[PDB]
């Protein structure tokens, strides 16, 4: 219901098809936060 762009469009398609299931994914604001922290000269990353 929020900033996860691909799941937004997957959920609508599933609901129209009568399948009430979701594939969550990653929010966009977390990626924005990672980029903003990297712009300060700090190396922050996801591992594994």
């Amino acid at each position: 219901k929020s900033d996860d762009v691909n799941g937004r469009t997957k959920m609508y398609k599933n609901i129209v098809d009568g399948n009430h299931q979701m594939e969550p994914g990653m929010p966009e604001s977390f990626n924005v936060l990672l980029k903003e922290i990297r712009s300060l000269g700090i190396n922050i990353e996801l591992e594994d």
Binding site: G18, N19, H20, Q21
Partner: protein, 79 residues
């Protein structure tokens, strides 16, 4: 219809496990080709799953046994 889930909770023993079992059965009845084990009376698959659990016809062990049996039948009849 449903107003309370107390009987299903006592059948399963947990609300957190009841939600998962009912979701599994409801998804079987909704997206899969399964048929309800109780007479559906203008009900949705979630309420049907809750009513099936309330009568002791559905639990985790039964679902696992049914899945194993279906997979074995599919693998045997594939050839």
């Amino acid at each position: 219809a449903r107003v309370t889930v107390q009987d299903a909770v006592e059948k399963i023993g947990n609300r957190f496990d009841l939600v998962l079992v009912a979701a599994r059965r409801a998804r079987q009845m909704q997206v899969g080709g399964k048929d309800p084990l109780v007479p559906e009376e203008n009900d949705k698959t979630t309420v049907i799953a809750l009513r099936e659990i309330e009568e002791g016809l559905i639990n985790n062990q039964i679902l696992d046994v049914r899945e194993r049996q279906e997979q074995q039948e599919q693998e045997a009849a594939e050839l």
